[PDB]
Amino acid sequence: EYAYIDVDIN
Amino acid sequence: PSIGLVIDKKEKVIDAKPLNNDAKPILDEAAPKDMPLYDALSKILDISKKNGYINSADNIVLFSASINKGIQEIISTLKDVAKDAGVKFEIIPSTEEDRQKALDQNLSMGRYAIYVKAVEEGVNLNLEDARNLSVSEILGKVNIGKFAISD
Known part of the structure; x- marks a missing residue:
């Protein structure tokens, strides 16, 4: 909806 | 992951x-x-x-975000999450245009931005390395002082 957030680990 | x-x-x-x-x-x-x-x-x-x-060796998390000073509230949350957990962070603002290009090749917004950036600066980063190298490794390869930095 408002925002998309991606997180990368390792 | x-x-x-x-x-x-x-x-x-x-x-x-x-x-x-x-x-x-x-x-x-x-x-x-x-x-x-x-x-x-x-x-x-x-x-x-x-x-x-x-772990202590790979202690860097890569965040990326796209909307649709609102992003600043999001950015502050991402900083807090990493600092409070004791891990270093990189936050790469993105766009809906780039998010779709990232999705089309099954990459996160952050790894896609980094992959594109490495290519433009002449770093030898193939597609498989962009998708599978560790965060700390790909940042060491891309962040070599060949493009502008600001806060």
Whole structure:
């Protein structure tokens, strides 16, 4: 909806 | 592991998707849906530390975000999540245009931005390295003082 957030680990 | 979240304006997680297969077990235990963005990412980092993905050697998390000074509130949450967990961070603002290009090749917004940046500066970073190298490794390869930096 408002925002998309991606997180990368390792 | 790579995880994609969708938030509403109050930063409530309304959707969560594993961007690769090894993110599935972390998402299952984290159960971020309907949680505050801060809580969701904090538990994701907590689980990641338990499972062995986060350690003293690889202590960097890569965040990326796209809207649709609102992003500044999102950016502050991402900084808090990492600092409070004791991990270094890189936050790469993105666009809907770039998010779709990233999705089309099954990359996170952060790894896509970094892959494109390396290519433009002449760094030898192939597609497989962009998708599978560790965060600390790809940042060491791309951040070599060949493009502008600012805060």
